[PDB]
Structure formats: structure tokens, C-alpha cells
Design a protein around this ligand. Structure first.
Ligand SMILES: *CCC(=O)N1CC(NC(=O)Cn2c(C3CC3)c(C(=O)N3CCc4c(cccc4OC)C3)c3cc(Cl)cc(C)c32)C1
Ligand SMILES: Nc1nc2c(ncn2[C@@H]2O[C@H](COP(=O)(O)OP(=O)(O)O)[C@@H](O)[C@H]2O)c(=O)[nH]1
Ligand SMILES: [Ca+2]
Ligand SMILES: [Ca+2]
Length: 165
């Protein structure tokens, strides 16, 4: 009966939801993943000395969403730093989560993915400011280089712990 955390990764098509999830678990960068595959992925982690099982839903669908959202304990809000629309979508993802959870206090982390890319359309400042207003952590990640990937998920677990403690 080990501690489990139900995590849900959300965000627009092509932001790197699958790449982040697979990097975390497999330590491998998928250069392309079938965008129709929605599945749960398991990971055993130790975070600040506490061992736990992560049950991570990598969302892809475009019914049972309400249920995974309802049972989800923490949400990774992923955008890509070279996709302004994906950043604008964040607001709506957050709103839907609050709506179905019927709670203003839901563990979430804002993730700006593709930090390895030489060009970007979303400033760090913009993302930092948004996260500041939401009162949630902001992490820049690269599923390719692995920069910040562990930290993004670990930070989400720490937010879930705070919420429960
Ligand atoms: C290319 C395949 C892929 O990765 N994806 C992600 C995208 N699928 C979803 O976003 C499914 N979805 C929705 C559906 C309307 C799109 C919602 C939702 O109800 N939102 C509220 C309205 C809204 C959202 C995002 C952008 C713009 C919006 O309206 C202006 C979000 C979802 C909420 C969550 Cl928490 C998760 C998911 C998967 C989701 C195809
Ligand atoms: N350069 C770079 N490419 C990435 C990164 N993360 C994902 N990608 C690529 O962007 C595309 C979309 O990634 P994917 O995980 O399928 O996005 P999803 O639709 O959100 O699940 C794929 O070609 C990935 O290889 C990243 O951190 N850096
Ligand atoms: Ca995907
Ligand atoms: Ca907060």
C-alpha cells in the first residue's frame, strides 16, 4: 500500500507531453510519438527521501476525461516556448481543471518545454509572471536534453504533498 500520486499531463498538441513523460520514465528522448496515444505510465520515485509510485496520465484525446481529471491529484500544465497558442491555452486548461475539481486549490505546475531550441516566441518573463499570478511553480524544461524534467514532476509531487499536508 505504498504512497501513490495520480499526475495528469495536459497542454496543446506538440508541446512535448509524451516526450516529457517518456524522458522521465525511460531516460530516452522520443523524436516523435503517435499523437493519438493516450495512456497511463508508471514510475517509482524517491523524492526528498520518500518513496512513491507516480501514476502519470499522458493526455492526447480531442466523458472519461472528467473522471481522470476528478481522480487526478496534480496537473502539469505544459506549453512550448516556440508556440504562443500553446501558452495561451494554459489559461483554459487551468480553468477546466478548477471547474471539474470544483476547487481553487488544485496542485499544478507550469512547464515551459523545448528550452533547448535556439528561437522562442514566449518570453520567460511572460511565463514567470503568469505562474506568479496563479501562485504556482514555473519550470523550464527540455525533454530532449532532460534539463528540468525530473524537477518538473518532483515539484508537482511536492505541491501535492503541501496540499494534502
Ligand atoms: C495532438 C494531440 C494532443 O496532444 N492534444 C491535446 C488536445 N486535446 C485536448 O485538449 C482535450 N481537452 C479539452 C478539449 C477542448 C479541447 C479540454 C477542455 O475542455 N479545455 C477548456 C477549453 C479549452 C482548453 C484548451 C484550449 C482552448 C480551450 O477553449 C478556448 C481546455 C481539456 C482540459 C484538460 Cl485539463 C485536458 C485535456 C486533454 C482537455 C489534443
Ligand atoms: N527540441 C525539442 N523538441 C521536443 C521537446 N519535447 C518534445 N519535442 C518534439 O516535439 C514534437 C512533439 O512532442 P510530443 O511529445 O509528441 O508532444 P505532445 O503532442 O504534447 O505529446 C516531437 O517531435 C518531439 O520530439 C524538447 O524539449 N525539445
Ligand atoms: Ca502525445
Ligand atoms: Ca499556490
Amino acid at each position: 500500500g505504498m504512497t501513490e500520486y495520480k499526475l495528469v499531463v495536459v497542454g496543446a498538441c506538440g508541446v512535448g507531453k509524451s516526450a516529457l513523460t517518456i524522458q522521465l520514465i525511460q531516460n530516452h528522448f522520443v523524436d516523435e510519438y503517435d499523437p493519438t496515444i493516450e495512456d497511463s505510465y508508471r514510475k517509482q520515485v524517491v523524492i526528498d527521501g520518500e518513496t512513491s509510485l507516480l501514476d502519470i496520465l499522458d493526455t492526447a484525446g480531442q466523458a472519461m476525461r472528467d473522471q481522470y481529471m476528478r481522480t487526478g491529484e496534480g496537473f502539469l500544465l505544459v506549453f512550448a516556448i516556440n508556440n504562443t497558442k500553446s501558452f495561451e491555452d494554459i489559461h483554459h486548461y487551468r480553468e477546466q481543471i478548477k471547474r471539474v475539481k470544483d476547487s481553487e486549490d488544485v496542485p499544478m505546475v507550469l512547464v515551459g518545454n523545448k528550452s533547448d531550441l535556439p528561437s522562442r516566441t514566449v518570453d520567460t518573463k511572460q511565463a514567470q509572471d503568469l505562474a506568479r499570478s496563479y501562485g504556482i511553480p514555473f519550470i523550464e524544461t527540455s525533454a530532449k536534453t532532460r534539463q528540468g524534467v525530473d524537477d518538473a514532476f518532483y515539484t508537482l509531487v511536492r505541491e501535492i504533498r503541501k496540499h494534502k499536508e
